[PDB]
Design an enzyme around this catalytic site. Structure first.
Site, PDB file in Angstrom:
ATOM      1  N   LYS A 195      -7.899   1.590   0.821  1.00  0.00           N
ATOM      2  CA  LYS A 195      -7.684   1.232   2.227  1.00  0.00           C
ATOM      3  C   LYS A 195      -8.177   2.351   3.152  1.00  0.00           C
ATOM      4  O   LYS A 195      -8.773   2.084   4.196  1.00  0.00           O
ATOM      5  CB  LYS A 195      -6.220   0.925   2.512  1.00  0.00           C
ATOM      6  CG  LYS A 195      -6.024   0.364   3.930  1.00  0.00           C
ATOM      7  CD  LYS A 195      -4.603  -0.152   4.022  1.00  0.00           C
ATOM      8  CE  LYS A 195      -4.085  -0.461   5.398  1.00  0.00           C
ATOM      9  NZ  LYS A 195      -2.866   0.366   5.659  1.00  0.00           N
ATOM     10  N   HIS A 248     -11.416   4.326   7.227  1.00  0.00           N
ATOM     11  CA  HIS A 248     -11.816   5.606   7.839  1.00  0.00           C
ATOM     12  C   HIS A 248     -13.051   6.289   7.355  1.00  0.00           C
ATOM     13  O   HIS A 248     -13.342   7.312   8.037  1.00  0.00           O
ATOM     14  CB  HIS A 248     -10.620   6.618   7.621  1.00  0.00           C
ATOM     15  CG  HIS A 248      -9.349   6.135   8.257  1.00  0.00           C
ATOM     16  ND1 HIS A 248      -9.156   5.959   9.610  1.00  0.00           N
ATOM     17  CD2 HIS A 248      -8.174   5.752   7.655  1.00  0.00           C
ATOM     18  CE1 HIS A 248      -7.930   5.494   9.808  1.00  0.00           C
ATOM     19  NE2 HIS A 248      -7.321   5.360   8.642  1.00  0.00           N
ATOM     20  N   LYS A 260      -6.637  -3.799  16.020  1.00  0.00           N
ATOM     21  CA  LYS A 260      -6.010  -2.475  15.754  1.00  0.00           C
ATOM     22  C   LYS A 260      -6.333  -1.641  17.006  1.00  0.00           C
ATOM     23  O   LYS A 260      -7.508  -1.575  17.419  1.00  0.00           O
ATOM     24  CB  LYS A 260      -6.468  -1.924  14.435  1.00  0.00           C
ATOM     25  CG  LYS A 260      -5.714  -0.671  14.007  1.00  0.00           C
ATOM     26  CD  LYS A 260      -6.226  -0.098  12.691  1.00  0.00           C
ATOM     27  CE  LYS A 260      -5.518   1.236  12.469  1.00  0.00           C
ATOM     28  NZ  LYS A 260      -6.389   2.135  11.678  1.00  0.00           N
ATOM     29  N   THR A 268     -10.041   6.005  13.620  1.00  0.00           N
ATOM     30  CA  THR A 268     -11.000   7.099  13.489  1.00  0.00           C
ATOM     31  C   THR A 268     -11.828   6.924  12.222  1.00  0.00           C
ATOM     32  O   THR A 268     -11.264   6.646  11.176  1.00  0.00           O
ATOM     33  CB  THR A 268     -10.344   8.531  13.497  1.00  0.00           C
ATOM     34  OG1 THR A 268      -9.537   8.589  14.703  1.00  0.00           O
ATOM     35  CG2 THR A 268     -11.375   9.671  13.423  1.00  0.00           C
ATOM     36  N   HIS A 289      -3.884   8.338   4.235  1.00  0.00           N
ATOM     37  CA  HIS A 289      -3.613   8.016   5.657  1.00  0.00           C
ATOM     38  C   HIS A 289      -4.328   8.998   6.575  1.00  0.00           C
ATOM     39  O   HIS A 289      -4.333  10.165   6.196  1.00  0.00           O
ATOM     40  CB  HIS A 289      -2.105   7.977   5.935  1.00  0.00           C
ATOM     41  CG  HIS A 289      -1.567   8.414   7.253  1.00  0.00           C
ATOM     42  ND1 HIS A 289      -1.403   7.601   8.340  1.00  0.00           N
ATOM     43  CD2 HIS A 289      -1.117   9.646   7.635  1.00  0.00           C
ATOM     44  CE1 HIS A 289      -0.909   8.299   9.350  1.00  0.00           C
ATOM     45  NE2 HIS A 289      -0.699   9.529   8.934  1.00  0.00           N
ATOM     46  N   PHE A 290      -4.831   8.523   7.678  1.00  0.00           N
ATOM     47  CA  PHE A 290      -5.469   9.395   8.678  1.00  0.00           C
ATOM     48  C   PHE A 290      -4.383   9.714   9.699  1.00  0.00           C
ATOM     49  O   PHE A 290      -3.912   8.769  10.381  1.00  0.00           O
ATOM     50  CB  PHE A 290      -6.705   8.754   9.265  1.00  0.00           C
ATOM     51  CG  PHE A 290      -7.462   9.700  10.170  1.00  0.00           C
ATOM     52  CD1 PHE A 290      -7.027   9.906  11.481  1.00  0.00           C
ATOM     53  CD2 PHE A 290      -8.589  10.337   9.657  1.00  0.00           C
ATOM     54  CE1 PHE A 290      -7.733  10.778  12.298  1.00  0.00           C
ATOM     55  CE2 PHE A 290      -9.296  11.225  10.481  1.00  0.00           C
ATOM     56  CZ  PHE A 290      -8.851  11.437  11.793  1.00  0.00           C
ATOM     57  N   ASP A 291      -3.972  10.977   9.835  1.00  0.00           N
ATOM     58  CA  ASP A 291      -2.899  11.305  10.784  1.00  0.00           C
ATOM     59  C   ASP A 291      -3.326  11.675  12.196  1.00  0.00           C
ATOM     60  O   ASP A 291      -2.683  11.253  13.177  1.00  0.00           O
ATOM     61  CB  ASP A 291      -2.069  12.477  10.186  1.00  0.00           C
ATOM     62  CG  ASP A 291      -0.655  12.459  10.752  1.00  0.00           C
ATOM     63  OD1 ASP A 291       0.031  11.425  10.678  1.00  0.00           O
ATOM     64  OD2 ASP A 291      -0.194  13.494  11.274  1.00  0.00           O
TER      65      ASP A 291
END
Length: 124
Positions: free
Chosen positions: A7, A12, A41, A45, A119-121
């Site tokens: 995902k 990303h 969404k 990024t 996950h992209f934070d």
């Protein structure tokens, strides 16, 4: 079911280009990566670096995530990124985005074995 690791790459990673050369990039990529399938969404990024360089961040600067989690990592170096932010004219299913090319540090959450980004934070 799609893995958290898969995902992350879908949402990303954009290793095939160095930067967003068109102001239409977000409109195209948000749609093509299926980030607009159920709803628009609001923000996303894209990272324009090799997958190996992004996976490597899981062994770089350990930092707390925005939500307090402690499995986040900040890249030692700045990376080529593209910020996608929904515009005021965005209307499902015609999701619209503002494209912003930047050079920043990325902060990702890592998990599993192999230990990879899931996950992209944030970008700082």
């Amino acid at each position: 079911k799609e893995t958290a690791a898969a995902k992350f790459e879908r949402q990303h990673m954009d290793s095939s280009t160095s930067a967003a050369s068109s102001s239409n990039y977000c409109n195209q990529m948000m749609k093509s990566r299926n980030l607009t399938k159920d709803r628009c969404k609001p923000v996303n990024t894209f990272v324009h670096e090799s997958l190996a360089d992004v996976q490597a961040v899981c062994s770089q600067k350990n930092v707390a995530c925005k939500n307090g989690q402690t499995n986040c990592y900040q890249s030692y170096s700045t990376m080529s990124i593209t910020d996608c932010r929904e515009t005021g004219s965005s209307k499902y299913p015609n999701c619209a985005y503002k494209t912003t090319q930047a050079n920043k540090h990325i902060i990702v959450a890592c998990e599993g074995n192999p230990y990879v980004p899931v996950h992209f934070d944030a970008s700082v």
